[PDB]
Ligand SMILES: Nc1ncnc2c1ncn2[C@@H]1O[C@H](COP(=O)(O)OP(=O)(O)OP(=O)(O)O)[C@@H](O)[C@H]1O
C-alpha cells in the first residue's frame with residue numbers, strides 16, 4: 020500500500036510516486052471482488068514530460084515492476100519511421116501481437132503488457148512553425164472497434180505542446196505529470212546512492228562530506244551527478260598511478276587507491292559543465308581587460324544594477340523586469356552588462372548574441388531565441404542577456420531594411436510571464452535609441468540607463484594613471500595639452516590608440532599619441 | 544477557470560466611475576445577444592491608451608456572462624508561426640465556437656496579430 024520506491028534507485032522522486040499511485044492505479048490495488056462488483060474500467064495510459072536526463076525511464080521501469088507485469092517492449096520515436104509507403108504502420112502494428120494472442124487464448128485472465136514509447140513527439144502532426152496516417156493508426160489500435168483490456172502505454176516527451184490533441188482525450192492517455200529538476204535533499208540522496216558501493220570497501224569517506232558536495236551543485240540534473248562521481252574516480256586513479264610510478268613507495272600505499280576530496284573539488288571545477296546552470300568560462304571572453312573605475316558614472320551604473328537585482332529577487336506583484344543600456348559606440352556597454360549579471364549570484368545565467376548565428380536565416384534565429392527562453396523558464400531564478408539588438412534585427416540605414424519576424428518574436432517575448440512562482444530578469448544593450456523608439460520597442464522596456472563617454476581632461480589623466488602606460492614627464496605634457504577640456508573619446512578607442520602609439524621608438528611616442536588623439540576631435 | 548485567473552492577476556479595483564460605465568455597457572451587450580432573433584451576431588471593440596488595462600476588463604466581462612463556451616485567442620501562443628498557421632488556428636477556434644448553442648470569443652491584441660510596424664508600413668494582408 021505504501022510502496023517501496025526509496026529502496027531501489029529513484030532516489031529523489033518520492034512525492035511524484037505517491038501522487039501517481041494515488042491518482043490513477045486505484046483499481047489495481049483493491050480486492051478484485053468489489054472492483055468487479057462495481058464494474059469500473061482501468062486507465063489505459065499515462066504521460067511524463069520534463070527536462071532531459073532527470074530520471075523518467077527509471078520511473079517507468081519501477082512502475083512496470085510494481086504491477087508484476089511482463090517484460091516491457093521499449094521503443095524509440097525516430098526508429099519508427101521509414102521512407103517507403105505503408106512501412107511505419109507495420110512497425111506500429113507489430114507491437115500488439117502478443118497482447119492480441121493472449122487476449123484471445125486466455126480470455127479475460129491474461130496479465131499486463133506494458134509498452135514504453137520514447138520521444139513520442141516525433142510521430143505527430145502539430146509541427147506548425149509527418150505522415151498523419153501514423154497517429155491515426157496508433158489511435159485506431161489503442162482504442163477501436165475491437166477492445167484490448169490487458170495493456171498499458173507509457174509515453175515520454177521533452178516538448179509537451181507539440182502533441183496531437185486527439186491523443187489526450189479521456190479513454191486514451193489521460194494522466195499527465197512533470198518530473199522537474201531536483202533540489203538539495205534530492206541531490207544528497209542521488210549522490211549517496213551512487214557512492215554507496217565505493218564506501219562499502221571503505222575506500223571513500225576520507226574527509227569528504229556529501230552535504231558539502233551537495234550545496235556546491237546548484238542546478239545539476241540527475242545524470243550529471245553520476246558523471247561527476249565517475250570523473251572524480253578516474254582522475255584520482257590516474258593521479259595515484261602517476262605518483263606511485265614516480266616514487267618507489269612501499270606496497271602499503273601501492274595498494275591504497277583512495278579517492279580524495281581534492282579530486283571531487285577539482286573535477287567539479289574543471290570537468291563537469293552543467294547544461295541548465297551557470298558557466299564561468301564565457302565571462303572572461305567579454306570582460307577581458309576588466310573594469311577600471313575612471314569616474315562616477317561607472318559607480319552609478321553598477322549601483323543601479325544592484326538595485327534592480329534586489330528589486331527582482333524578493334518581491335511580488337511584479338515577477339518580470341527589463342532594462343536597456345544605451346550609449347554612443349565604443350563606450351563598453353557589454354562589459355558592464357556582463358558584470359551586472361555576474362554580481363547577482365543567480366543560478367542560471369545565459370548570454371545570447373549574434374556571434375553564434377553567422378549565416379542563419381530569420382527562422383533559425385527565432386528558433387534559437389525561443390529555445391534559450393524555454394531553457395530559462397525551467398528554473399526558480401534566471402538572467403538573460405541580449406548583446407546587440409540592432410544586429411539581431413539586421414538593420415541598415417539605407418532602405419531601411421530589416422527582418423520583421425524576429426522583431427515580432429522579441430516584442431511578444433518581452434511581455435510573457437513565466438510559469439507560476441518563478442522570476443526572470445532581462446538586460447538588453449544597443450547603440451541606436453532613436454530607431455528603437457520609432458519602432459515602438461522602447462515602450463516595452465521597463466527602464467533605461469545611459470552610458471556616457473570621457474569628456475574632461477582629468478578623467479583621461481586618471482584613466483591613463485590607472486592603466487599605467489605612460490610616465491610622469493610625458494603625463495605633464497599630456498595634461499598641459501588636454502587641459503582644453505575638448506575631448507570626446509571611447510574607452511575601447513582609447514585602448515586602441517594607446518596600443519597603436521606604443522609601437523614606435525621611445526622618442527616620438529608622446530607626439531604620435533597626441534596627434535592621433537587630436538585627429539579624433541569629435542563634437543556631439 | 545484558469546485563463547481568467549491567469550489574465551486577471553491582481554483583481555479589479557474601483558478607482559473611479561469609468562469602470563462602472565464599461566462594465567454596464569458590457570452587461571447590456573451580453574443581454575442583447577442573449578435575447579433576440581434578428582441580431583444573431585454581435586461585435587464590440589475596446590480601445591484606449593497603452594498600459595490602460597484593456598485585457599483585464601474584457602476577460603472580466605467574458606467571465607461574468609455565464610455562457611457555456613468561452614475561449615481567448617491571444618497572440619503569445621503563436622510565437623514563430625507563419626501566416627498560414629495563424630489563419631488555420633483562428634479558423635479552428637471559430638469553427639469550434641460554431642458547434643455550441645451559446646458562445647463568446649475574445650480576440651486580444653489585434654495589432655500584434657497583423658504584425659504592424661509604423662516604418663513602411665508592413666503587415667500580413
Ligand atoms: N570601466 C569600464 N567599463 C567598461 N569596459 C571597460 C572598463 N574598463 C575597461 N574596460 C574594457 O573595455 C572593454 C569594453 O568594450 P566593449 O567590447 O564592451 O565595447 P562595446 O560597447 O561592446 O562596443 P560595440 O558597442 O561597438 O560593440 C573591455 O575590454 C573592458 O575590459
Ligand SMILES: Nc1ncnc2c1ncn2[C@@H]1O[C@H](COP(=O)(O)OP(=O)(O)OP(=O)(O)O)[C@@H](O)[C@H]1O
Nearest residue numbers: 551552553554555556593594595596597598599600
Ligand atoms: N480597474 C482595473 N482595470 C483593469 N486592470 C486593473 C484594474 N485594477 C487592477 N488592474 C490590474 O491591471 C492589470 C491590467 O493590465 P493589462 O495587462 O490588461 O494592460 P494592457 O492594456 O493589456 O497593456 P497592453 O495593452 O500594453 O498589453 C492587471 O494586473 C489587473 O489585475
Ligand SMILES: Nc1ncnc2c1ncn2[C@@H]1O[C@H](COP(=O)(O)OP(=O)(O)O)[C@@H](O)[C@H]1O
Nearest residue numbers: 029030031071072073074075076077209241242
Ligand atoms: N532520481 C535519480 N536517482 C538516481 N539516478 C538517477 C535519477 N534520475 C536520473 N538518474 C540517472 O540518470 C540516468 C537515467 O536517465 P533517464 O531515466 O534515461 O532519463 P531520460 O530518459 O530523460 O534521459 C541513469 O544514469 C541514472 O542513474
Ligand SMILES: [Mg+2]
Nearest residue numbers: 353406407448
Ligand atoms: Mg555591443
Ligand SMILES: [Mg+2]
Nearest residue numbers: 597598651652
Ligand atoms: Mg493587451
